[PDB]
Structure 1
Amino acid sequence: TEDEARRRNWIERGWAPWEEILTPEADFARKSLNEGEEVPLQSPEAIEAFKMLRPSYRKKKIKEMGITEDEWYAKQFEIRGDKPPPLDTSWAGPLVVRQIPPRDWPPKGWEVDRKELEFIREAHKLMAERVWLEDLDKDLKVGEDATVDKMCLERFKVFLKQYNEWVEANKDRLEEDSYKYDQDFYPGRRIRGKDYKEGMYELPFYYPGMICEGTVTTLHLYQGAFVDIGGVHEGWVPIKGNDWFWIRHFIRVGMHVIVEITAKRDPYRFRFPLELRFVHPNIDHMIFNKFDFPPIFHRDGDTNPDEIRRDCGRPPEPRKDPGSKPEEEGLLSDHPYVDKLWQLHVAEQMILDDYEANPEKYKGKKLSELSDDEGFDERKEIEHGEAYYKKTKLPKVILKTSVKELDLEAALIERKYHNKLMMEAKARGEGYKIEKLRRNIEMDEYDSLHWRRSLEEREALLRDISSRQALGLPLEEPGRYKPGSFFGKDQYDPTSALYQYDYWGEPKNSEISKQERMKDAHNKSIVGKGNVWYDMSYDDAIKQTIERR
């Protein structure tokens, strides 16, 4: 019906019947077009709108009403429709305050006397003291008994002394950073230039829970009301969208309010470092649209989205769930350094081979004294390229290796030791096989260290799972791994029956058919028509050879 749809538009889509201030021509167009196309205007509104098409008639009408022209110009910018019920803000007892230094004093990287700081911090335990309204009368100090010198504010005065020292030493640097980072001024930014006045409160002077008196300076339809609370930054009351349709009757520019600080944030990251709520007038019942998160800047140095969301309190970028439990995956034992050890192993072996074949080159030089060739760049150890094999062209990678990272003294003794055994085997009419060398043994011990590291993580993970499942703590990082249908209703699923094209046989021009026929030719050029006698895995076809040997 045309009651739920209107309500749905207000709540879901943020509709509001905002006033349209029309010119006489636009006002005539809407009043006359409701009657017909080319017909005598009959309605008193359209007839009057026809007369108002001449500004001379308007001036005569204005004079007959006794008002001025500018007053008439201001009456057209008037809120139409009904008015909201007027506010009735009641005070929940008296306003009782203490002068408590902010908990976050001092700022990061600013050094203060830690003995004075501990004296300051004693006042933070005063929040625990209980105050009853039936007791703010027994020993109330008034008049001459309530002068400032009579009050104990010693801990707050030490904070003021430290605060003033920080202000005098950091005022210029803070203004310089404002110019470096913020190109234009905006409410919530640091007041600078000619608009700055000495005595404005810096951000470390404020803390959540403080009550302030201020004036409304700016209303933003999508952000809220901005209040001057005596600081170098304006406070921000978040109000947006439809709520302003009624709230604009009560929150006006220039009026005096009482606000409470609800949050204080870093102005480099957050647009509005001081977050407020109105205490007087109370408009809690009129605010329905809420900010999920406080708005932030996306600045020049913000290149990693995961870093940005940690700077604020925002969730991680969601991912598709892998569908596999990490505690059920096989352990990892391939040490990443083994690939480097293999390169050194090959470099030593081919250096040893050249030593055997061409020992005349290696005369008078100790192998440990060898140096790389002139042009050896340590930064170009990996060169990517491409090579042609017959007609096929496979890319080829060049792995440059230094001679000074090789242990040729130990390799030569191992090489000579195995030559002697090979010679002795040859003299006996027997063959000799080397099972592994020192570098291969070095690769296994690095693998064993990596395997042990994986085992210890898995064992701790299994205990961690049982503790978290018992105490109802998350197993995965919250916000990560969103479920299905979160990423869209339409997704290409090749396995799904709604995306399959070989229902009536695989197409002959399909990419699958072309690839299947390609490897059949590649295999047939090796094997052909022979029947598969029996097949065995490589791993089980190695043990049996070891057993026979």
Structure 2
Amino acid sequence: TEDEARRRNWIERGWAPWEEILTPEADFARKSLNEGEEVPLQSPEAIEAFKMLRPSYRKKKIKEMGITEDEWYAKQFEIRGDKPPPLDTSWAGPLVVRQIPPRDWPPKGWEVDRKELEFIREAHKLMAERVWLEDLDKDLKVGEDATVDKMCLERFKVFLKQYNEWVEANKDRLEEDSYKYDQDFYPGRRIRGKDYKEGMYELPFYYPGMICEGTVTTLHLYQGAFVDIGGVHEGWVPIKGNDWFWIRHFIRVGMHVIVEITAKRDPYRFRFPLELRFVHPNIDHMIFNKFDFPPIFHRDGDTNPDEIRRDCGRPPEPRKDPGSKPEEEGLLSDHPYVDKLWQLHVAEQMILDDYENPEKYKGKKLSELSDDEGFDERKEIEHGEAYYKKTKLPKVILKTSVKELDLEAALIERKYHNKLMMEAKARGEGYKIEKLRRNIEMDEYDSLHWRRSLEEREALLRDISSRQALGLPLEEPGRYKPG
């Protein structure tokens, strides 16, 4: 079925019949080859294309039709047909507006008079006041009595004070940061250098829900319209793909438009920091190819996908469902310091095994032992190889510094257990030491870690029951997928 596949190409595959502008020989090919291999051409249009193959004939056609030859070179780019039905865009009542300061004032890390800021911020409660169209006209101030001096804009004027002070302190830093981070200018980027005009609105001046008059300065087929709304950044209306096939008729470059700011993004992370919507040329009934997420930069300083996603709100990288259930697993008792304690343990024992060649240790305390010459503290582990029965295995070599070792008390145990082992010989038996102070310590650390794992699991069980009752996610929503 042809038309169903045409629709499937439009909707899914992104097809559109983008008109092709052809040199007259390519048109002659794309017409004559419809009729045969070497047939004498019969179609009037193919004969016309054959005649157009001479520019002198094109000249004569120009003179006969009277259209100037640059006007004809323009007219060859005309849309091939089926122009869309004109927009009939109608205002939903009057545009009734308040000068309300942005809510994200001040910018991050900028410090302001917090009592002035609280005065500014009192304006935001005004958004809860009703306005009715049955009530606007009865009290309407007009003319001389609507001159600016009649309007209470004092919280906005304080906002403008703080804004101008911020611009004065930051316009140069922001231009430097633009040249540092953004190599080439592109519509969403900060207007900079010879293109910057003193008095362009900085990005803190804008906020979602603000209405702007602007000019459509550029169209990009894959991104949408970019609009000068008076700022150092162009606003962005997301329009993508074959939607432009109709919108190309209505949203030209150079149009004046009314737009609504719909989101304001960080200009470092996000490629287009002001998302916009067209209000007057309302085209919402022809934008089908919505963006799932606002485009971002992947930058020289970025190094961790998870950190970029949560810097921009993308969902996590899927993983395979582990099939285990978090709460059904064991409890990690094995404290990670115990391996290091074990090194320290055997190091103490090694020292004591050399102190019980006693003549080498005469003249100093055990706590007075140093490391040897050349003791490289800057790597804990060496690697190498070891051999037995004509075969080889890897060897890991663990350095331990004598400064780490509790040697005096370890000696106290050594001497105590030696004495008991002699009494054990007087008992007529061996002497199994059940634990040393290092093994006791390692068990204490394991008990602390098991206690964490217990209290974690118990809180997890409460959490699970609460989330299941409340329909909240147990695992991180984006983290796992089956395929």
How far off is 1:34 after superposition? 1.1
Partner secondary structure for residue 280 of structure 1 = coil
Per-residue CA deviations over 1:215-262 (Å, capped at 9, x if unaligned) read 110000000000000000000000010100111000000011100000
Q: How far off is 1:279 after superposition?
A: 0.3
Query: What is the CA-CA distance between 1:427 and the residue it aligns to?
Result: 3.0
* Segment drifting more, 161-170 vs 384-393: 384-393
- Residue 435 of structure 1: CA displacement? 1.4
- What is the DSSP-based 3-state SS (H/G/I as helix, E as strand, rest coil) of the residue aligned with 2:480? coil
Classify the secondary structure of the residue corresponding to 2:403: coil
Q: Alpha-carbon deviation of 1:453?
A: 0.8
- Aligned mates of 2:138, 2:311 — CA distance in 1: 49
Deviations 1:359-410 (Å, cap 9, x if unpaired)?
A: 1112111111111101111122210111121211001111111111111111
CA distance in 1, matches of 2:105, 2:427: 87
Residue in 1 that maps onto 2:36: 36
Residue 294 of structure 2 aligns with which residue?
A: 294
Distance in 1, matches of 2:457 and 2:2, equals 61
| Cα drift, residue 425 of structure 1 | 2.0
1:16, distance to aligned residue in structure 2 (A):
0.6
CA distance in structure 1 between the aligned counterparts of 2:119 and 2:39, rounded to whole angstroms: 87
Q: Secondary structure at the match of 1:404?
A: helix
Shift of 1:324: 1.0
- TM superposition shift of 1:212: 0.4
Shift of 1:143: 0.8
Deviations 1:290-327 (A, max 9, x none): 00000000001111000000001100000000111111
Deviation at 1:138, TM superposition (A): 1.6
Aligned pair 1:59/2:95, yes or no?
A: no
Question: Are 1:440 and 2:450 an aligned pair?
Answer: no
User: What does 1:184-333 correspond to in 2, within 5 Å?
Assistant: 184-333=184-333
Q: What secondary structure, in the 3-state scheme, does the structure 2 residue paired with 1:257 have?
A: strand
Deviation at 1:40, TM superposition (A): 1.4
What is the alpha-carbon root mean square deviation over aligned residues?
0.8
SS at match of 1:395: strand
Q: Distance in 1 between matches of 2:249 and 2:172?
A: 41
Q: CA deviation at 1:430?
A: 2.7
Question: What is the Cα deviation at residue 123 of structure 1?
Answer: 0.4
3-state SS in 1 of match to 2:360: coil
Deviation, 1:289, is 0.6
| Alignment deviations for residues 171-201 of structure 1 (CA, whole Å, 9 cap, x no partner) | 1000000000000000010000100000000
Aligned counterparts of 1:232 and 1:172: Cα–Cα separation in 2: 13
Partner of 1:420: 419
Say which SS state the counterpart of residue 261 (structure 2) adopts. strand
**Cα displacement (A) at 1:412:** 1.1
With over 3 angstroms needed to count, the CA separation of the structure-2 counterparts of 1:456 and 1:42, relative to structure 1, is same
Query: How does the TM-score come out when normalised to structure 2?
Result: 0.99
Alignment partners' CA distance in 2, 1:128 and 1:467: 34
Structure 2 CA distance for aligned equivalents of residues 17 and 99 of structure 1:
45
CA distance in 2, matches of 1:473, 1:169: 45
Q: Deviations over 1:20-48 (max 9, x none)?
A: 11111011111111111112111111111
Between 390-399 and 126-135, report the one with greater CA deviation. Answer: 390-399
CA distance in 1, matches of 2:380, 2:286: 68
Deviations 1:512-531 (A, max 9, x none): xxxxxxxxxxxxxxxxxxxx
User: Deviations along 1:76-106, whole A, 9 cap, x unmatched?
Assistant: 0100111111111111100100000000000
Distance in 1, Cα, partners of 2:112 & 2:210: 24
- Decide whether aligned partners of structure 1 residues 235 and 428 sit closer, same or farther in structure 2, where only a CA change above 3 A counts: closer
- CA offsets, 1:467-493, max 9 Å, x none? 11000000000011101xxxxxxxxxx
1:105 aligns to what SS in structure 2?
A: coil
Indicate whether 1:21 and 2:29 are aligned: no
For 1:135 and 1:287, locate their aligned partners in 2 and report how far apart those are by CA, in whole Å.
Answer: 35
Partners of 1:432 and 1:30 lie apart in 2 by: 102
C-alpha distance in structure 2 between counterparts of 1:380 and 1:247, whole Å: 64
> Does the residue aligned with 1:300 lie in a helix, a strand or coil?
coil
**Aligned equivalents of 1:429, 1:254: Cα separation in 2:** 106
Task: After superposition, give the CA deviation of every residue in 1:123-162 in whole Å (9 maximum; x if it has no partner).
Answer: 0000000000000122111111100001101110000000
> 1:432: Cα distance to partner?
2.0
Name whichever of 421-430 and 186-195 sits farther off.
421-430
CA distance in 2 between counterparts of 1:430 and 1:66 reads 125
What runs of 5+ residues in structure 2 fail to find an aligned partner?
Answer: none
CA distance in 1, matches of 2:413, 2:375: 28
**Alpha-carbon deviation of 1:341?**
0.7
Q: Which moved more, 1:127-136 or 1:347-356?
A: 347-356
Task: Tell me how far apart the structure 1 counterparts of residues 418 and 70 of structure 2 sit (CA, whole Å).
Answer: 111
1:354 maps to what in 2? 354
Task: Note the 1:94-133 alignment, pairs <5 A.
Answer: 94-133=94-133
2:59 and 2:460 mapped to 1: Cα distance? 85
Q: Which residue of 1 aligns with 2:408?
A: 409
Q: What is the Cα deviation at residue 429 of structure 1?
A: 2.7
2-structure distance, mates of 1:324, 1:268? 40
Q: Give the SS at the match of 2:359.
A: coil
Measured in 1, the distance between the counterparts of 2:360 and 2:199 equals 84
The CA distance in 2 between the partners of 1:68 and 1:202, in whole Å, is 46
Structure 1 segments of 4+ aligned residues over 6 angstroms from their partners: none
Q: Distance in 2 between matches of 1:78 and 1:462?
A: 68
Structure 1, unmatched stretches of 5+, are: 484-549
- Return the alpha-carbon distance in structure 2 between the equivalents of residues 413 and 288 of structure 1: 81
User: 1:144–1:374: structure 2 CA closer, same or farther, 3 Å change rule?
Assistant: same
CA shift for structure 1 position 5: 0.8
How far, CA to CA, are the matches of 1:21 and 1:228 in structure 2? Answer: 31
Cα distance in 2 between the residues matched to 1:367 and 1:283: 85
CA displacement, residues 337-356 of structure 1 (integer Å, 9 cap, x when unaligned)? 10011111111112112111
Q: Which residue in the other structure is 1:497 paired with? A: none
Deviation at 1:424, TM superposition (A): 1.7
State which drifts further: 99-108 or 439-448.
Answer: 439-448
Give the aligned partner of residue 77 of structure 2: 77
* Separation (CA, whole Å) in 2 of partners of 1:63 and 1:104: 63
Structure 1 residue 431 displacement after superposition: 2.4
Residue correspondences, number? 482
Range that drifts further, 381-390 or 292-301: 381-390
Aligned equivalents of 2:88, 2:379: Cα separation in 1: 77
**Structure with larger RCO (C-alpha < 8 A, sep 6+):** 2
Report the Cα offset of residue 420 of structure 1: 1.1
CA distance in 1, matches of 2:267, 2:82: 40
2:462 corresponds to which residue?
463
Q: 1:283 to 1:428 in 2, by over 3 A?
A: closer
Alpha-carbon shift at residue 19 of structure 1 (Å): 0.6
C-alpha distance in 2, partners of 1:53/1:333?
A: 86
How many angstroms apart in 2 are the aligned matches of 1:20 and 1:337? 71
Cα shift at 1:68: 1.3
| Equivalent-residue separation in structure 2 for 1:31 and 1:442 (angstroms) | 91
Q: Aligned partners of 1:48, 1:87: CA distance in 2, in Å? A: 37
- Tell me the CA shift for residue 53 of structure 1: 0.8
Q: Distance in 2 between matches of 1:418 and 1:457?
A: 40
Secondary structure at the counterpart of residue 185 of structure 1? coil
